[PDB]
Amino acid sequence: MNPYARGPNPTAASLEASAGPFTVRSFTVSRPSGYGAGTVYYPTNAGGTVGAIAIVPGYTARQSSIKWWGPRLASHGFVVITIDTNSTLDQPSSRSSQQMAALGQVASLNGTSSSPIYGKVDTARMGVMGWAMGGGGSLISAANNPSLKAAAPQAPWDSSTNFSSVTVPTLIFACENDSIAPVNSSALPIYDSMSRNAKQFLEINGGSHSCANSGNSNQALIGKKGVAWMKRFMDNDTRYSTFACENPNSTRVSDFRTANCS
């Protein structure tokens, strides 16, 4: 009866694998509207319309830093747009505006008959992700747009840590040994500020600032968690509640916290 459920029942193995059940294709956005560039990843065989997620990099960075999420998420039934910002030196607020413009363009493309994603998106179900300043931008997006269904920033940074206005289910990936956005002054205070939402804090043991980026050695766990979080909250899919809410009880995790999760 959940009209948003897609794919086979999940297992730890299926979520830890490099690829999900659906086949993925991608394209470059010809005329980015409000951001620098973008790549759209989508499932070719999901079986119904799926939600959309927009992912932004950190300061100085480009799509390569976050690109692994595209196929990883899309293969589980999401349309994912990874973006380059107008400038590599844009700040979090600007990143947030750009992230939201990218979701808007995904909505446009869903209504464009020549697009490969024509009619593949449920525009009412969206999510936001991003690294560092792009993670802070994701949190700003969530605060300003509470109709967003899920947020999952990584190693976030904002000059302000008060995200008490965020009511969107938010999973914060953190990196233990982050020296750019130290956990104790960035990710953790951000997590602690959020009081009205389902939330989770997952710190990778021994991780540098780039611990959740393309090429990381914890793709099994990080990808399982990201996908589970998005499935649970973007699709209201309670088949993923244990995966989304559980403490992994893993040696790869140096700090785990969660609240209001079901």
Numbering used by the authors: 0 to 261
Give the article text.
Specifically, I. sakaiensis adheres to PET surface and secretes a unique cutinase-like enzyme that degrades PET. By hydrolyzing PET, the enzyme produces mono-(2-hydroxyethyl) terephthalic acid (MHET), TPA and bis-2(hydroxyethyl) TPA (BHET). The enzyme is named PET hydrolase (PETase) for its PET preference. PETase adopts the canonical ɑ/β-hydrolase fold, in which the strictly conserved catalytic triad S131-H208-D177, as predicted from sequence alignment with homologous enzymes that exhibit PET-hydrolytic activity, is found on the protein surface.
In both crystal forms, the R103 side chain of one protein molecule penetrates into a surface cleft next to S131 (or A131) of another protein molecule. It appeared likely that the R103 side chain occupied the putative substrate-binding groove and prevented the substrate from entering. We therefore produced and crystallized the double mutant R103G/S131A (DM) for complex formations. A comparison of the wild type, S131A, and DM crystal structures suggests that these mutations did not significantly alter the overall protein fold (Cα root mean square deviation = 0.144–0.2 Å).
